[PDB]
Amino acid sequence: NITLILFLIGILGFVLNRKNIILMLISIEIMLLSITFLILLSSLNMDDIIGQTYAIYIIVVAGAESAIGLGILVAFYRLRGSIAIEY
């Protein structure tokens, strides 16, 4: 239930935000944690170590994609000098 509310918070990050692109990166991190938390709790209910394994690979991949996204942001910011959307 908490995991569902957290997914909304990550969803709501995209609704409320017109100009903060950094918040877009953070809202993906919230969504991914919410989905991993749901898998972890379900894996506990169904006594299944595969759920924990799936969550570990989501942490690995979401950590890997955070680094790519920050690198892409750095290449973007090197040329623009701002992460602000003019709106």
Partner 1 sequence: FLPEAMVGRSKIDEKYPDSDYPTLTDKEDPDMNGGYI
Partner 2 sequence: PKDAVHLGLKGAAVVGGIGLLFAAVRTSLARKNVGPWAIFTRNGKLAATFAAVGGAYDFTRAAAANLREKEDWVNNGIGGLFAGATMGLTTGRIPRVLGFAALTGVVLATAEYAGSGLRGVFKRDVDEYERKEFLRKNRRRPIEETLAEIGEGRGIKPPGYYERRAQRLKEKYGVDINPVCADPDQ
Partner 3 sequence: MIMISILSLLLSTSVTLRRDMSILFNRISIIALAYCILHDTMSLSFISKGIGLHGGLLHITNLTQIFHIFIFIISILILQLTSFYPRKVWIPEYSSLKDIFFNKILYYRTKIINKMGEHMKIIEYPLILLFVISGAVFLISTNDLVSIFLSIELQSYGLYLLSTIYRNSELSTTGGLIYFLLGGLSSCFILLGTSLLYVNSGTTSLDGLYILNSISDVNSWYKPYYLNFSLLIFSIGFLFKVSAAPFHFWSPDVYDAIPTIVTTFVAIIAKISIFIFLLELVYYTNSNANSYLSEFSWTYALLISSLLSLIIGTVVGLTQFRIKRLLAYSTISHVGFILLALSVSSIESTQAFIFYLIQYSISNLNAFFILITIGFSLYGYVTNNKEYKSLLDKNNSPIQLISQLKGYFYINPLLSLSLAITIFSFVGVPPLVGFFAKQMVLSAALDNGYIFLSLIAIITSVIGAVYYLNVIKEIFFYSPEHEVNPVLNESDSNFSLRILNEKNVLIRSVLLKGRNIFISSPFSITISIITNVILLFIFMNKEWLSMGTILVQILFSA
Task: Give the interface with partner 2 as residue ranges (CB under 8 A).
Answer: 15, 18, 87
Give CA separation, 62 vs 5, 66, 75, in Å.
Answer: 20, 6, 20
Residue 2 or 21: the one with the smaller Cβ distance to partner 3 is 21
For residue 67, the minimal CB distance to partner 1 (Å) is 21
3-state secondary structure of 19: coil
Question: What span, in angstroms and rounded, lies between the C-alpha atoms of 74 and 77?
Answer: 5
Q: Which does 15 bind (CB under 5 to 8 A by kind): partner 1, partner 2, partner 3, none?
A: partner 2
For residue 15, the minimal CB distance to partner 1 (Å) is 20
- Phi (first) and psi of residue 48, to 5 degrees: -130, 115
For binding to partner 1 (CB under 8 A), which residues are involved? 76, 80, 85
